[PDB]
């Protein structure tokens, strides 16, 4: 068979490699024909695989420096990002494509653990990211802080930055290292910071009952966006870390000022509002321990207040006595269901408080 080596094929192959890198339309016949050429070169050429690795290393560098120029050609920070995200979208997409035809190169030296895919991302880190990363981050946080103040932007801008920190980490035994120490931490801080001043202001301007309405709609949107911006495809539970943050900022540091309205709302049977309070204080550790008291303490209190106040009739009949306790139990279990959604912990609360009223309303008593 007539031997076909690297130098024989690479000239027909290369042109396609360039198109793939630059995301320029390649025909199916070329796509296929490439797989065939790569394979042939590898098995037939003695030094075939080794060279293709070199050739790729080079052609990948060229394109990158072409993009490097296109990106770094901007002084203005807002355009440096906008320009990066665009060149990134493309390159990052082609990272899942260019490696395909060279899987036979791997076995001679999976598309994710790809040597080529690795060489692609790495070369891009050294030339574009590793340097302007910090500028991109702080530029991205700004966009987020903006969205919180009602300014909507191309969400794909902060995402492109996340994808960058997540996918471009050269750490052998930890891939989210620069994601946590940098992007995540940045997001957490700009968040906590934002509220450290944003929250208290709304509390003093509106009612503590209006604030709970706020600290709730907040925890909702902060968790909805934190899902599109932070890493979720991978397993890191970053979204959780952000919430613990929002909760320790929007609730944990305002619990005492929140639970202070507990005994008052529980008296006017404001199930609507108590439902809200339960929803939040349930997120904070030891958050509802005090509500379970403010309840079983209201029962005991209000319960013996219903008996003594109606004793005028209750004492004459043993059945007008039971009816009163029944009217109450039905009244409190009413609250518990409506407000505290029958949480097993709040039922235990009632069952212990009520069971207490029963032994304190005792009117009659005889003995030997």
């Amino acid at each position: 068979k007539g031997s076909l080596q690297f130098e024989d094929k690479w000239d027909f192959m290369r042109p396609i490699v360039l198109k793939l890198l630059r995301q320029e339309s390649v025909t199916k016949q070329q796509w296929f024909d490439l797989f065939s050429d790569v394979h042939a070169v590898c098995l037939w050429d003695d030094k075939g695989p080794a060279k293709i690795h070199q050739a790729l290393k080079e052609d990948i560098l060229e394109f990158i420096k072409q993009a490097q120029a296109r990106v770094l050609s901007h002084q203005d920070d807002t355009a440096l990002l906008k320009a990066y995200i665009v060149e990134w979208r493309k390159f990052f997409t082609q990272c899942d494509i260019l490696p395909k035809p060279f899987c036979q190169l791997e076995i001679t030296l999976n598309v994710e653990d790809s040597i080529v895919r690795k060489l692609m991302l790495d070369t891009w880190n050294e030339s574009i990211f590793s340097n302007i990363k910090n500028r991109l981050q702080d530029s991205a946080m700004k966009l987020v802080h903006a969205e919180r103040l009602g300014e909507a932007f191309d969400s794909q801008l902060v995402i492109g930055v996340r994808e960058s920190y997540v996918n471009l980490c050269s750490n052998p035994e930890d891939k989210l290292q620069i994601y946590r120490d940098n992007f995540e931490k940045a997001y957490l801080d700009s968040t906590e910071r934002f509220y450290r001043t944003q929250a208290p202001s709304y509390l003093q301007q509106n009612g503590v009952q209006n604030y709970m309405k706020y600290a709730d709609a907040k925890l909702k949107e902060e968790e909805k966006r934190a899902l599109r911006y932070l890493e979720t495809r991978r397993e890191c539970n970053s979204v959780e870390a952000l919430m613990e943050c929002c909760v320790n900022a929007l609730v944990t540091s305002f619990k005492e000022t929140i639970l202070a309205e507990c005994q008052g709302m529980i008296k006017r049977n404001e199930t609507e509002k108590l439902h809200l309070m339960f929803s939040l204080m349930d997120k904070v550790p030891n958050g509802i321990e005090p509500m379970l008291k403010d309840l079983e303490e209201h029962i005991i209190s209000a319960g013996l207040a219903d008996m003594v106040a109606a004793a005028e009739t209750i004492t004459t009949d043993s059945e007008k006595y039971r009816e009163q306790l029944d009217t109450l139990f039905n009244r409190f279990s009413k609250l518990v269901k409506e407000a505290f959604q029958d949480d097993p912990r709040f039922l235990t609360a009632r069952d212990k408080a009520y069971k207490a009223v029963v032994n304190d309303a005792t009117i009659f008593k005889l003995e030997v």
Binding site: K1, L43, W44, D46, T108
Partner: protein, 163 residues
């Protein structure tokens, strides 16, 4: 060669490449071995775990009297067929359990009941590449003299048996 630690190595190894053939059927019960071979042709066998402590592998094969089970003993660093079986061959001791099965399959395939080792039951469809290999190893033993890529010659070197 006979050594406590050397025999444990030779075994652990020969038992390693055994699971690289496809005839190892793990902890297949005896009834199940009977089901698989019950209707098979004389010589159809397979290897599986022995519910015994002195030996590790059992050979389930189809014979004149139907499916049978018999040991694959290991002593003095060599693998031999069961003692019970009256064997008449130039070679009775091998290093690899796979080397054993091959030798006999070549002889047998090419005192009451007769015992043959011809067609092993594969646990799952072998790779096309391997079937080609098996096919080539049946044709010749002189790999390198072939018109193949220097690497595929290496693939044909990682397994020299005809089954």
């Amino acid at each position: 060669h006979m050594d406590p630690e050397f025999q444990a190595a030779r075994l652990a190894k020969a038992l390693r490449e055994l699971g690289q053939t496809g005839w190892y059927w793990g902890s297949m019960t005896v009834n199940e071995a009977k089901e698989k071979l019950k209707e098979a042709p004389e010589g159809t066998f397979l290897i599986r775990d022995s519910s015994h402590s002195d030996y590790l592998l059992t050979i389930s094969v189809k014979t004149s009297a139907g499916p049978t089970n018999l040991r694959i003993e290991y002593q003095d660093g060599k693998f031999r067929l069961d003692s019970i079986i009256c064997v008449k061959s130039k070679l009775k001791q091998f290093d690899s359990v796979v080397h054993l099965i091959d030798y006999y399959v070549q002889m047998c395939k090419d005192g009451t009941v007769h015992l043959y080792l011809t067609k092993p039951l594969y646990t799952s469809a072998p790779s096309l590449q391997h079937l080609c290999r098996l096919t080539i190893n049946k044709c010749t033993g002189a790999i390198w003299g072939l018109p193949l890529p220097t690497r595929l010659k290496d693939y044909l070197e990682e397994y020299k048996f005809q089954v």
